[PDB]
Each structure stands twice: as structure tokens, then as C-alpha cells.
């Protein structure tokens, strides 16, 4: 529907049958989840944020449900402070920024 | 506008008569600009995210134009990789997330 930004835009996600909380993040290119175990092939990547860089594992074609919307795509896993849903998946689920 | 998220949401900002570019970041609580000279008193803060924390300076009641919408608010200044408009000022200009 329509999300205020008076508070953090947090939504429940479901990934591999687990429920997680995550932040709808227009300032993130990619979706980055806190450390967790996923199946299949991965490649190591370095991503930047506000305070510097972190190592993550990239996993492709992972099914995620974000606030009721089924998505499938790339998930980075690493020491992010909060689970983040970035533009790759926001675009998949039809999310725009309006004002 | 209804800004789409196929590309980083970079927008025109105007502050103190200077034209800059900033990223609309729903993942940021507050607005943080690259090093620049602003008027008035300020206080040191730390802000954190991926990669850890950086030291910034906080200025109050700073007028800023974001996509032609006028805002006035707290602006942090410090070594962010990119100018960032956070939720503080996204709220003032009327921003919502819509899926």
C-alpha cells in the first residue's frame, strides 16, 4: 500500500521458510541480509556503505517474500547491521518513491 | 514525482546557493552531506551503518531545496561517500513508499 517514512520502513520478509524483519532501502543497490545459511553456489563480493566496506557472499535466484509480494533474485549475506531490501528487489515488487 | 528505482534516485539539491546532487535514502534516518561550509553553531555526532561509524557535524534549521521542494532542517556534514537525503527531510517534502 503506502508507507510513511516517519518511522523506519520495516516490513516482514520470508526467506527459506524463516520470518525476518527488513528495511525498505532506496539507498541500497542490493539486498543484503544478516549472516544466515543459504543453499547452492556463491561468490564473494565487497560492498560499500556509510562507514566503509564489508565482505558478503552473493547468492543468485533466491526466492523471497517481501510484504506479501513474491520475489526471486540475488541476495548478499554478510555483517550488515540490519536486513536491507535494496533497489534490485524493490523494483521487482513495484515499489516507487512518491512526493 | 513518483521516482522509479531502476537507477539510484539521485536528485538536484540546492543549499546555500550551491547546486548539488543527492541520493534519496529511505534507509537513512537523517540527512548527511559531503563536507561543506554551513553557517551557525554545530555539534559533533557519530553516524553508523554498513562498514561502521563516521564523525559528522550537525547544523540546525538549514534551508535546502530538494527537487524544488523547500525544506528546512537538521543537516549533518561529514565524510559520507555521497550526499544523502534521509527520512528527516524525505518526510518534510511529502515522501511515501508505494507498492
Amino acid at each position: 500500500p503506502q508507507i510513511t517514512l516517519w518511522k523506519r520502513p520495516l516490513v516482514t520478509i520470508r526467506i527459506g521458510g524463516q520470518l525476518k524483519e527488513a528495511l525498505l532501502n532506496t539507498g541500497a543497490d542490493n539486498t543484503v541480509l544478516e549472516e544466515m545459511n543459504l543453499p547452492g553456489k556463491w561468490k564473494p563480493k565487497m560492498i560499500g556503505g556509510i562507514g566503509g566496506f564489508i565482505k558478503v557472499r552473493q547468492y543468485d535466484q533466491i526466492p523471497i517474500e517481501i510484504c506479501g509480494h513474491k520475489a526471486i533474485g540475488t541476495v548478499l549475506v554478510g555483517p550488515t547491521p540490519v536486513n536491507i531490501i535494496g533497489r534490485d528487489l524493490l523494483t521487482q515488487i513495484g515499489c516507487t518513491l512518491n512526493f | 514525482p513518483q521516482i522509479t528505482l531502476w537507477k539510484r534516485p539521485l536528485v538536484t539539491i540546492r543549499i546555500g546557493g550551491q547546486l548539488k546532487e543527492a541520493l534519496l535514502n529511505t534507509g537513512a534516518d537523517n540527512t548527511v552531506l559531503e563536507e561543506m561550509n554551513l553557517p551557525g553553531k554545530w555539534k559533533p555526532k557519530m553516524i553508523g551503518g554498513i562498514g561502521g561509524f563516521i564523525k559528522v557535524r550537525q547544523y540546525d534549521q538549514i534551508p535546502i531545496e530538494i527537487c524544488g521542494h523547500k525544506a528546512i532542517g537538521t543537516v549533518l556534514v561529514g565524510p559520507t561517500p555521497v550526499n544523502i537525503i534521509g527520512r528527516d527531510l524525505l518526510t518534510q517534502i511529502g515522501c511515501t513508499l508505494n507498492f
Partner: peptide, 10 residues
């Protein structure tokens, strides 16, 4: 608690 979750691809 951290509050700025800028993130940029490799």
C-alpha cells in the same frame, strides 16, 4: 544504534 544504511554494489 546505527542509522544510515547506504549500500553500493561492487
Amino acid at each position: 544504534r546505527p542509522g544510515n544504511f547506504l549500500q553500493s554494489r561492487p
